[PDB]
């Protein structure tokens, strides 16, 4: 599913992501824009052989099982395919565990490089929330 901007904002809010671990809703929207272009089916293979999945490009090295990433973990206890569903619940639940892991949103390289420090508020401007 390709979400619209304000549509994803409202789904993330409904799922408890606004100010989760202190990160305002715009940070989460901005990270999804640059990690997946708001597409839940986005997948990208990494050089180490792991793959990133879904709207927040969660990686199989640590967070989900895809059966093809040696020596990896599945800390969110889910098949990586769950992260590609039109329902964002699994991506949100897993992202809450990631962002509570110590490094905050820095776990998402695109957030650090394209959202951190910017006017993220712009991402939810105009939206009914
Ligand atoms: Cl695996
Ligand atoms: Cl933090
Ligand atoms: Na894994």
- Going along the chain from its start, the domains and CATH numbers come out as 1-129 (1.10.530.10)
CB 28 within 8 A of CB 17: yes
Residue 14's alpha-carbon distances to 18, 60, 64, 87, in angstroms, are 9, 26, 23, 12
CB 72 within 8 A of CB 51: no
Extract long-range pairs of 12-18: CB within 8 Å, 24+ residues apart: 12/88, 12/92, 13/129, 15/88, 15/89, 15/92, 16/92, 16/96, 17/92, 17/95, 17/96
Compute, in angstroms, the gap from residue 102 CA to the centroid of ligand 2. 7
Q: Using what technique was this structure determined?
A: X-ray
Residue 48's alpha-carbon distances to 45, 51, 71, in angstroms, are 8, 9, 11
Residue from 7, 18, 35, 66 carrying the catalytic annotation: 35
Instruction: Give the span between the Cα atoms of 31 and 112, in whole angstroms.
Output: 9
Helix (H, G, I), strand (E, B) or coil at 39: strand
User: Which pair of structure tokens corresponds to residue 67?
Assistant: 């059966």
Beta bridge partners of 51: 45
User: Which pair of structure tokens corresponds to residue 65?
Assistant: 């099982």
Instruction: Give the span between the Cα atoms of 39 and 42, in whole angstroms.
Output: 6
């Amino acid at each position: 599913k390709v979400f619209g901007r304000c549509e994803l904002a409202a789904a993330m809010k409904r799922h408890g992501l606004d100010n989760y671990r202190g990160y305002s809703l715009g940070n989460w929207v901005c990270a999804a824009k640059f990690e997946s272009n708001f597409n839940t089916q986005a997948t990208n293979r990494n050089t180490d052989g792991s793959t990133d999945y879904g709207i927040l490009q969660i990686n199989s090295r640590w967070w989900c099982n895809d059966g093809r990433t040696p020596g990896s973990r599945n800390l969110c206890n889910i098949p990586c395919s769950a992260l590609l569903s039109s329902d964002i619940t699994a991506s949100v639940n897993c992202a809450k565990k990631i962002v509570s892991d110590g490094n905050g949103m820095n776990a998402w390289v695109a957030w650090r490089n394209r959202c951190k420090g910017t006017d993220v508020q712009a991402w939810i401007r105009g939206c009914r929330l």
